[PDB]
Amino acid sequence: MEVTAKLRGAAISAQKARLVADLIRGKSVAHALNILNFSNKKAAVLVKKALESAIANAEHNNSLDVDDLKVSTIYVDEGMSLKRIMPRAKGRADRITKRTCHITVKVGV
Amino acid sequence: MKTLSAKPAEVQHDWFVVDATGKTLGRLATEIARRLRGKHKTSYTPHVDTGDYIIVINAEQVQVTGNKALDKKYYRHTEFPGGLKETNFEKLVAHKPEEIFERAVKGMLPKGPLGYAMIKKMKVYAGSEHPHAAQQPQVLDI
Amino acid sequence: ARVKRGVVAHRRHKKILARAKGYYGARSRVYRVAFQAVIKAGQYAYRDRRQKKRQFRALWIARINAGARQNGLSYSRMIDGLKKAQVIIDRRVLADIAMHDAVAFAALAEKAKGALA
Amino acid sequence: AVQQNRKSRSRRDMRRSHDALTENALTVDQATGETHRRHHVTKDGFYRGRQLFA
Amino acid sequence: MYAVIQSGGKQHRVVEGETLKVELLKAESGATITFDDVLMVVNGDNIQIGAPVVAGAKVTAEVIGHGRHDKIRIIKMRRRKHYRKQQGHRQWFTELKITGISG
RNA sequence: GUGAGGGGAGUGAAAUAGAUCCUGAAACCGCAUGCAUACAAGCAGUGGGAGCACCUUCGUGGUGUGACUGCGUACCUUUUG
RNA sequence: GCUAAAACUAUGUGCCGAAGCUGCGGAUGUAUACUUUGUAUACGUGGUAGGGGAGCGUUCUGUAAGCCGAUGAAGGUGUGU
RNA sequence: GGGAAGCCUACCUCAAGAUAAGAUUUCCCUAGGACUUUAUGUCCUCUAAAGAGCCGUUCGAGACUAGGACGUUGAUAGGUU
Numbered sequence: 111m112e113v114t115a116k117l118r119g120a121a122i123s124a125q126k127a128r129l130v131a132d133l134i135r136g137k138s139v140a141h142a143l144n145i146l147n148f149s150n151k152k153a154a155v156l157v158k159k160a161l162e163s164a165i166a167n168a169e170h171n172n173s174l175d176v177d178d179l180k181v182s183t184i185y186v187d188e189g190m191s192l193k194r195i196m197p198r199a200k201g202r203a204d205r206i207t208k209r210t211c212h213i214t215v216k217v218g219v
Numbered sequence: 220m221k222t223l224s225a226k227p228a229e230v231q232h233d234w235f236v237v238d239a240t241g242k243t244l245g246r247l248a249t250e251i252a253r254r255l256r257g258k259h260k261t262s263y264t265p266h267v268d269t270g271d272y273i274i275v276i277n278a279e280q281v282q283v284t285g286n287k288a289l290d291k292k293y294y295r296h297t298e299f300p301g302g303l304k305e306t307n308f309e310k311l312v313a314h315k316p317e318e319i320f321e322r323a324v325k326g327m328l329p330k331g332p333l334g335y336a337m338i339k340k341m342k343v344y345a346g347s348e349h350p351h352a353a354q355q356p357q358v359l360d361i
Numbered sequence: 362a363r364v365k366r367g368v369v370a371h372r373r374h375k376k377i378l379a380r381a382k383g384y385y386g387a388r389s390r391v392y393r394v395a396f397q398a399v400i401k402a403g404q405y406a407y408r409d410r411r412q413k414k415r416q417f418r419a420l421w422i423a424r425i426n427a428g429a430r431q432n433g434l435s436y437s438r439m440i441d442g443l444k445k446a447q448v449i450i451d452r453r454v455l456a457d458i459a460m461h462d463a464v465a466f467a468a469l470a471e472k473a474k475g476a477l478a
Numbered sequence: 479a480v481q482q483n484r485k486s487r488s489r490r491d492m493r494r495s496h497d498a499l500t501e502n503a504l505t506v507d508q509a510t511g512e513t514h515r516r517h518h519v520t521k522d523g524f525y526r527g528r529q530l531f532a
Numbered sequence: 533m534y535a536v537i538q539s540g541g542k543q544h545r546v547v548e549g550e551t552l553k554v555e556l557l558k559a560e561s562g563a564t565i566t567f568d569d570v571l572m573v574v575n576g577d578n579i580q581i582g583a584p585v586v587a588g589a590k591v592t593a594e595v596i597g598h599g600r601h602d603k604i605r606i607i608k609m610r611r612r613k614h615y616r617k618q619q620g621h622r623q624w625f626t627e628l629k630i631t632g633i634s635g
Numbered sequence: 636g637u638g639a640g641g642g643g644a645g646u647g648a649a650a651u652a653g654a655u656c657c658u659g660a661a662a663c664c665g666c667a668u669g670c671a672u673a674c675a676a677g678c679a680g681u682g683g684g685a686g687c688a689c690c691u692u693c694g695u696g697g698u699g700u701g702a703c704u705g706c707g708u709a710c711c712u713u714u715u716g
Numbered sequence: 717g718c719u720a721a722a723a724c725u726a727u728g729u730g731c732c733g734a735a736g737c738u739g740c741g742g743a744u745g746u747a748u749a750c751u752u753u754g755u756a757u758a759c760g761u762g763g764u765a766g767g768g769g770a771g772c773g774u775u776c777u778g779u780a781a782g783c784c785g786a787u788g789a790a791g792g793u794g795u796g797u
Numbered sequence: 798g799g800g801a802a803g804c805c806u807a808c809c810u811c812a813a814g815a816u817a818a819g820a821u822u823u824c825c826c827u828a829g830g831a832c833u834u835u836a837u838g839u840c841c842u843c844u845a846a847a848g849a850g851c852c853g854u855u856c857g858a859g860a861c862u863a864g865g866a867c868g869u870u871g872a873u874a875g876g877u878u
């Protein structure tokens with residue numbers, strides 16, 4: 111029985127967030143929290159928010175113990191993109207894609 | 220599916236020892252290649268190694284006919300510009316006799332992973348002794 | 362009477378992609394590449410249904426040659442001897458017996474060389 | 479200069495096979511008991527006994 | 533004990549109780565077929581090789597039924613020449629169970 | 636973070652009908668399991684074929700994978716080609 | 717790799733070798749005779765530009781105030797045939 | 798037998814991914830149960846060696862790396878004299 115939290119619409123690319131997700135996949139929650147607390151990556155903040163939300167859900171909605179939990183499942187999906195126009199030299203224009211992502215964290219005994 | 224292929228786990232490799240004293244190089248190499256590939260067994264299968272182990276002794280006593288001892292050339296290329304190296308049979312048989320047999324049999328075996336595996340079953344020695352007494356090779360007069 | 366193409370076109374593309382299962386990369390995902398890959402597979406199969414008979418006959422001949430040389434004959438001489446002895450067993454059965462029954466193959470070779478003599 | 483053929487997803491992932499992150503060196507501070515970065519002052523201002531902020 | 537029989541333009545090496553598929557025959561399902569043109573009979577050390585055939589030998593089999601093999605696609609295509617045609621095929625067979633072999 | 640977002644609760648026939656919300660395909664991008672893969676050269680398949688995993692009417696069976704091997708230089712157009 | 721050849725000349729006996737020919741099974745076109753037949757026999761069935769013949773599926777109108785459908789239509793996604 | 802600035806050696810550097818993966822010296826690890834898939838077998842408990850790395854002070858070594866030295870039993874860097 112895994113407990114899920116989802117953070118949707120995080121303003122960061124999935125490719126960047128997956129690097130942080132792979133770092134904590136499969137570890138105990140205390141170890142993962144230490145790693146996220148001392149990381150310098152921007153995606154670490156978002157992943158830590160999702161993990162803490164999942165732990166709180168497991169504690170309050172399902173009455174599980176903190177000490178036995180681990181990151182049993184985590185993956186990052188691509189969200190909706192924002193489209194913008196960047197003017198280049200000599201009257202040429204390029205299209206800019208501002209990417210977002212969805213983070214799913216599951217904790218299980 | 221009435222015609223059966225040989226199974227690698229059921230193949231039996233037998234050990235034979237051949238003396239090269241006075242034999243013609245190519246006419247010995249054809250028989251060695253045949254027995255390494257397993258063409259002499261009724262369970263022969265093109266994609267399975269069914270051959271035997273061959274130990275060649277007295278490798279530097281092998282002979283070539285005509286004037287090939289001085290005229291037959293062995294080439295290699297270091298891939299640097301102008302890097303073509305050349306030698307002949309007379310020098311090579313005195314220096315590295317096993318390389319002559321390796322070339323002669325490699326040219327007659329199939330070119331691929333199975334051929335690479337097949338040629339690993341040939342052991343060539345210059346002297347009259349070999350270190351494989353534990354495998355009890357049988358004398359094979361080919 | 363306006364006709365929309367979507368349902369039938371989707372069905373045709375899906376059938377092609379289903380036949381292209383297991384291929385590498387775009388060959389199992391992209392319709393154009395997959396369609397080129399299926400036709401070529403059919404062409405190869407048509408050619409190889411003919412090649413298979415030759416390959417299996419070659420295998421039978423090689424095994425018969427090995428058995429005959431174990432019994433003291435060459436393949437060509439053993440075939441000639443069987444022909445003169447009137448035996449009409451084919452190469453598939455001859456190779457099967459050579460592989461699985463050495464005594465029977467020895468008897469066949471003896472018959473062949475007796476007819477040759 | 480630009481590619482003549484689009485690169486496959488397999489080759490792209492093969493190039494990315496060196497992109498994984500690593501952990502920092504963390505350690506329990508014996509003076510205070512909290513996890514801290516090794517050789518660094520803790521977030522509360524402690525380092526090997528001395529305390530920085532009264 | 534095994535025997536060599538002719539069926540459908542091809543040859544088979546059979547033992548008692550064997551089930552095998554041959555070219556389509558006109559016999560009704562459940563009937564018995566008798567091969568009286570046996571080419572070879574081997575029973576242990578007893579080996580009989582027919583001159584064309586082994587005189588006196590018989591092989592009896594029972595017809596189990598008839599069926600069709602798996603479908604084959606035939607594809608022909610001449611590149612750059614605007615030509616292409618296809619067809620399917622399923623080959624009929626008759627299934628036999630060997631019940632008796634007598635030298 | 637009195638944010639965004641989510642987990643419960645509740646409404647509803649239905650919430651994976653939850654607000655750019657009927658259905659929800661493809662390109663494209665993740666996670667999980669099974670097998671293969673770090674001594675071997677090319678349109679990537681095709682005809683053979685060992686082993687392994689799951690299932691099984693226990694098999695001359697089904698599903699997935701595919702060591703090793705014969706053959707094999709995309710499609711369209713325009714052209715004498 | 718090959719030298720009383722695995723080279724050249726002459727002779728002989730075997731064998732390999734194609735989608736050619738034969739064997740077994742199946743489809744289809746034309747004609748003769750069976751004086752409906754759907755039947756046997758004989759001869760055919762590589763194809764660009766082209767010519768001829770026969771069909772599959774899609775949307776709409778009548779048949780249809782019929783027939784199927786919340787005990788689940790269309791559409792989507794698998795499996796079997 | 799003699800016979801050239803030419804060939805193989807000889808001189809310098811690299812070199813066992815030489816998958817044929819070579820050699821020598823020295824060092825380290827000597828615990829219990831259950832079960833069946835009876836085997837370098839699968840799960841529990843116990844154990845964590847010789848060494849290697851992370852980190853830090855750095856370099857006549859350096860794009861990042863890699864490589865060299867040192868980490869209180871200390872002169873590795875800065876300062877001080």
Ligand SMILES: NCCC[C@H](N)CC(=O)NCCC[C@H](N)CC(=O)NCCC[C@H](N)CC(=O)N[C@@H]1[C@H](O)[C@@H](OC(N)=O)[C@@H](CO)O[C@H]1NC1=N[C@@H]2C(=O)NC[C@@H](O)[C@H]2N1
Pocket residue numbers: 654
């Ligand atoms: N278990 C999980 C539990 C988690 C926890 N609980 C947390 C949680 O739960 N958080 C909830 C967050 C949800 C979300 N953030 C909140 C949100 O979105 N509020 C939206 C608030 C304002 C909203 N935009 C206004 C709106 O709807 N205007 C539309 C709009 O003008 C137009 O519509 C379209 N399409 O053009 C029009 C056409 O009809 O209709 C109007 N509307 C109508 N309504 C009427 C109707 O029904 N009949 C009659 C007529 O009056 C109808 N018109």
